Design a protein around this ligand. Structure first.
Ligand code: HEM
Ligand code: HEM
Ligand code: HEM
Ligand code: HEM
Ligand code: HEM
Lengths: 304, 306, 306, 305, 306, 306
């Protein structure tokens, strides 16, 4: 089975499009899904090899039942709201995700235009975010973002559905959350205090030693070990976005994994806390305003 | 006199920020203007040589009178509304323009963040547009955009104030207009009908012959000769922008010239027409929602303030 | 595991196509060169890496094969078959060896071509030499993006490389070449919309026409073939423009690779002889074939071990 | 005065087009000349900044009098044939030159297509050459080619007409010659013997010292001093070309100068020799098969027709 | 199953070679660093991706292996073997750990080397540090292209990575290093043709000399070795120039990776001890070895599992 | 017009600094090389254009000038003046000739240095050789962006090039070099905020600290100098990191160019001897100077006419 381009090369621009399917829009949606790979080639081919254009398409739990009969992916369910003592992860509506990436925003925009052109009248937009990465892979908090992502074979094993759900092998599960940051509060911390929040050095991106790293730092809470002592990993492609005039400074979080359990365990640790940590300290500077879960099928499933 | 970076190399990303100065905000604004070149170097220097970051700062007619106590530039006035039989060019408020360009949007965003950080509490944002160019220099209508801009010495002559206003030599005048397109109506035209609107071939960007090019084409109406028969020229750096969810497809127009009279003559021809043409056909698919005029001083004028 | 030649190359913007016939008594000289051609490719190319992207694919025709080698023949190797349609003809022309040379720059192609022909002088007669160049946005001489639906990755390997069905020749491929000359004056008299109906895709945006509007005699419709089981039958193309402005020669050099020549030959039959619904491929009303040849491109190790 | 792009950045591809103007063709030609800068922008602008497309347009002596009335450039005359004791510099016909340069051959070809499309039925092609430079600035003989070209203000002074002919300021003079090489004979020399022909080291491109450099080497014979003791300089953009099937391996020579007398003095030294040198040794491996001289006007002269 | 270190790297234009010995009592500090070296690589390199191309290959010598680890040894791990030829000598010098650091720029190499040695200060003693740079056309200090006949793709994996013959250490490799200093004055007194007879390839074009003219004591002849079964025995080299103009030091840093040290050692024996037809490799009359060490480079997961 | 050497070079990522002394009897050989150095620069660099950006700036010290030339001397040429502060010392060390070689890659620097030293062998003795590399975001070994406030364009030409004040030497410049070694262990014991107070700029974003927070003994405060007439006195710097990981040597090679040595020397006096408000530059508590030399860099035509 041929996967979608979940494992993409590094890209400096992205568009995230989340829509809901209107009553009676099902047929139009199914037609577009069968064409989205051809649209990706049409927009991208003439800008190769620098364009690096890809589109990953996902389908929500409620939408799946409206579009398809027969088997469901084993782990597909609606995003679960988490109501912590201090911080909340909200659930927001979304039936379809288009995660569009390239080396330039114009290519993302051209593909997004063709997709939405085909769906007009059949869907309602819920969210549209145009992301850009800083030139040294830093996010809006000023930390390098992506460093511990798995690569090569380890990435395939962490991200792609396999023999545990063989009809849907080559798929993946995506969790998205849009975060807005309190930059005034963040810039009031010393650099060393910021390092204790994240769990890595700011300028050099070296992980703090185990003797200094706080238990409520972001890296400590999002490190999870499996039954056998292996690291359970996800693949992230977080993107900054925002608007200077409205004072909106954001991180758009997207995490891919072979089962949603990994990502959801990380989120529970962050928002509900553990015995040793009240919550993830990154959340004292970051508010989640969307939350959705999608299954991203193998490419050949869509081509039918 | 050292000009600001009006004549920039080609860039693929831009931010246009237009603000108004709140009552009592004048001193904070003057301070920022004296530091804006230093901020540009701080954000940009470490991303050289590929970043190509620049900021051009412009000041409106009413803002000028509030900020500075001596001489005014000879051509500085508020944008003049044009009320045509069919189409209107509106005037909208704006005291400061920051025209920020680079090879990537993140550099534009970082400089815009530092600028607005210093101005918080002294200004109110009126417009913010994040622009991106298509990879073959096309605009939202699918035509190459920029081709007949002047270059080298001819660009300097067309854009920079000289001896005619010597205390402001090295400055320029910018007009901005944000345009929204009706893409559904545009895409219902045949390609040949689109070419008759613009005045150039779509795929190859070759200008149509004088025998076929209509009088109400964009290129015909924006071609102006002077008293002496010489071409009057401006320098444009138009940028696409929009939002696919809201069906917003735009062109952000910006034109620089040594005197606003050149730009204003072009706009009069477009909106009010001539003997041979009712109006520029591009306006049947393009609506202006902003309009403002600014003077962009020489860099040393900004540096030497308190 | 048998190592293929570089049939699946990265994108290249320059090519030289060299077709020669083996003179009487030239066989030994040719066999010696074939055993050295991979080493010549490395010699010319290694010092220009990683940007040079130099490769050479070497092919051998049906009649030449019997003169050079004893033992087994590849199952699908035969002379190119002439197709004599009601209006258009696909000619067959002589060729014993093909050198398909590709790089990011023409000079690298030329240096490799010079070393190869230097070794073969006196043993071969040149039949065709074409210097090809791709336009900067992957467009061909007709102004359409060319290569978009080529297969990639595993699907390309499956469509192109001989496997278990002919195990002695696994890792080989079959190449068909045809040099085409265009009537550019007639082509440019069509509207863009009418050109799109010839090809089956939009010209500017390269989006395929919807199934309800795509004509039955468009290029894309006639070259879309399904197998017995309903799977798409695919080939890998690397078509190149060529020409001479002084002689008014504007061309496309067609080269198609496939695991069996049956796929390519079925597409050619549909183009030239037509179907129930289509007289012929409308691209042929603006394109004349003046060469036609078929070659087997062995696995690299087969050439080395002789 | 705005010059044409005689002083171009380094380019790896070129097309040279030489044509003659047919009976009745003058009006069609004048129209094209007034549009050629706009054609260059149309083809090139959308491929910027990597394309680096330019076109330099030249006009021959005879053609000038057919196209324009009034003043002539002071140094414009037909190419002068040189019949040396061993080697000959031929003159061949040419009314118009288009020297098209870019980073890629497809862009050169697209501009050449638009130009010749406009001229069809008014001109006859005499020569068409598609040139490519080797990736380390080498020519067909394997030597770095271009090294001692002038740059900056020294280039402007060597190439552009100034006050000496003020109506034609910003123009230049181009000489072209297509050369075919005997590559078999060249490659039979040792590297050291090839270095003595050129006057520079082959791998490192360091000039041989004056005590070792022979008097009949290419660099010695093309080094010329003026009345004042100053170096007389030209700007060259030589390009390889060829066809492997026809065994055609060439250099297309093009040299620009403020007056043709500089280039002509170099040609006399190469073909007729000096007191100490019979001829340029490069000519024992290089045969000229074309030769033409053109004036390349300032850009505004063409625009104002 | 086993993930190799980045032995098969893309081409890189900068390198740092660091050889150290482990001081008495330094073993625990070293084991801790080895378990973190891949994390340090990501920390320095991720923010310069994708163009940085930073990698570190870590090797362990024979005597150090016994100090660090209990249990199985790699089958081919032994101390470098000194070769005492009639004229030329290959010396053995001390070295417990190798860090072979490569990237597209030297500053990335330097930053990673700084982090590594920061962790090891007080536990190791440096024996050699070389900063290498490539010439722009892949040439070495002798003016010849260097790397041409390296294997690529599948053939490289087969020649370099330990497999089923030593399954506990599958995905590992063996590295031999030698630092060479050249007598450039003697070399530059040769004619080019005499230099070509030393190396066995043409200098400007890098084409191999024919079998009839290539001397038996040329570098290429002596380092071409066939196995019992007739197959070529291959290694992967990434030689780097280095030097200091003021001290007249012009060097080649040799590093050769292979699946077993026997291949590399057979080449070294032929170079230094000769054959029946060749006293020694002529390259050694202009090149003196001043270091010599052998290391095993484990699979990446073996290092992580500490 | 006198043609300057390439003091105002584009940004380069690699450098070699070579300082030598002229041996007794070496004068003639040196004069010959000086007349050829521009020719050697073109020979090494032309074949790597346009990306190579190779340049060489040649300087001559005070004592060497009097050995090589007769007649008039540049007005400000004297030996480097040792500064003996209460805590910190700026040493003077020997040097007759400077070669400041810059390019986009180290191999071009190295090849030109090799040809220069080849011609001078036997006539000079090397005193210092440093191979410099820039970090990818223009940072120095202290982790701060280095070069941000250099002057550019016309302002740089005015700050650097000799003019009418010394008309026989117009187009020349004065270069001061100092090699600094840093105590990185002490430096990394400071917090980031304490480091920012040493330099006078924010570390990550390179924004200058406000005048109300910037200490009087910060690097930026002490190296900001105004003239009697209120003008900023500026120099042009091209500082390069260098080092050796095994010896724990981390350095900055300082080079500053100015139209008169008085500007540079005033900055050095403020740093080493202090002012009324500041004992010394706090950067010197983590930075030791181990060389110090002053050279005059003549106009290019002065060197050619020898
Ligand atoms: C909706 C807004 C606009 C769009 C999409 C647009 C687009 C274009 C295009 C595609 C061209 C042809 C290629 C080129 O030379 O750039 C052009 C030319 C031009 N436009 Fe616009 N334009 C717009 C508004 C304006 C306005 C408001 C002005 C003046 C106030 C203006 C002045 C010009 C000029 C002077 C030219 C060059 C004509 C010549 O000399 O050939 N444009 N524009
Ligand atoms: C004058 C010669 C030719 C020209 C200019 C040409 C041009 C094109 C163009 C523009 C496309 C559409 C974009 C793309 O997918 O590449 C195309 C598609 C294709 N052409 Fe050609 N073509 C030529 C000859 C041939 C010949 C001789 C064959 C087969 C024997 C062939 C087979 C194909 C195929 C299979 C496709 C892909 C159809 C699909 O599956 O969508 N073409 N060609
Ligand atoms: C037959 C084909 C020609 C070839 C292959 C050729 C090749 C070269 C080479 C390799 C160099 C040394 C590098 C350089 O400075 O560019 C050179 C220099 C030069 N060539 Fe040629 N050349 C040819 C024809 C001509 C002609 C016809 C002229 C003058 C009419 C000419 C004038 C020069 C000049 C002036 C130099 C610079 C000499 C100096 O000042 O150092 N060349 N040429
Ligand atoms: C002074 C040290 C060295 C220099 C400057 C040097 C240089 C070269 C050069 C220039 C080539 C030809 C182009 C190529 O294939 O890379 C070559 C090939 C080769 N060298 Fe070296 N070499 C050195 C030492 C060694 C050593 C010590 C070994 C083995 C232990 C070795 C093994 C090889 C091999 C295997 C080849 C490829 C031969 C073939 O199959 O064509 N070299 N070397
Ligand atoms: C000891 C090692 C040195 C280091 C690491 C160093 C580092 C820096 C840094 C990080 C900056 C701020 C960014 C910038 O504008 O460049 C700077 C500025 C400066 N440095 Fe240095 N520097 C050193 C030595 C010197 C010396 C010896 C001088 C002068 C004699 C000097 C003169 C300057 C000047 C003039 C500025 C710009 C001040 C302004 O904003 O106007 N530096 N230096």
């Amino acid at each position: 089975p041929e996967p979608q381009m979940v494992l993409s090369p590094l890209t400096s621009a992205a568009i995230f499009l989340v829509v809901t399917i209107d009553s009676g829009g099902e047929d139009t949606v199914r037609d577009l899904l069968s064409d989205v790979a051809s649209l990706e080639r049409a927009v991208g081919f003439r800008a190769q090899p620098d364009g690096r254009l890809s589109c990953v398409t996902g389908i929500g739990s409620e939408a799946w039942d409206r579009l398809f009969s027969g088997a469901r992916p084993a782990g597909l369910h609606p995003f679960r709201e988490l109501d912590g003592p201090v911080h909340r992860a909200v659930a927001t509506p979304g039936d379809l995700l288009f995660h569009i990436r390239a080396s330039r925003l114009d290519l993302c925009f051209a593909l997004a235009t063709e997709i939405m052109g085909r769906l007009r009248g059949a869907v309602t937009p819920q969210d549209e975010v145009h992301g850009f990465k800083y030139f040294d892979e830093r996010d809006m908090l000023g930390f390098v973002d992506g460093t511990e992502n798995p690569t090569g074979a380890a990435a395939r094993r962490a991200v792609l559905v396999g023999a545990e759900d063989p009809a849907f092998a080559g798929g993946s599960y995506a969790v998205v959350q849009k975060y807005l940051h309190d930059i005034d509060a963040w810039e009031g911390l010393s650099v060393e205090a910021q390092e204790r929040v994240i769990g890595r050095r700011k300028m050099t991106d070296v992980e703090l030693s185990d003797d200094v790293k706080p238990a409520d730092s972001h890296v400590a809470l999002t490190s999870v070990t499996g039954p056998d002592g292996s690291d359970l990993e996800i693949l992230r492609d977080n993107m900054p976005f925002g608007s200077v005039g409205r004072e909106e400074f954001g991180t758009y979080f997207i995490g891919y994994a072979r089962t949603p359990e990994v990502t959801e365990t990380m989120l529970e640790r962050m928002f509900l806390g553990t015995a040793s940590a009240p919550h993830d300290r990154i959340l004292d500077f970051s508010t989640a305003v969307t939350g959705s879960l999608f299954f991203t099928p193998a490419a050949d499933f869509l081509e039918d």
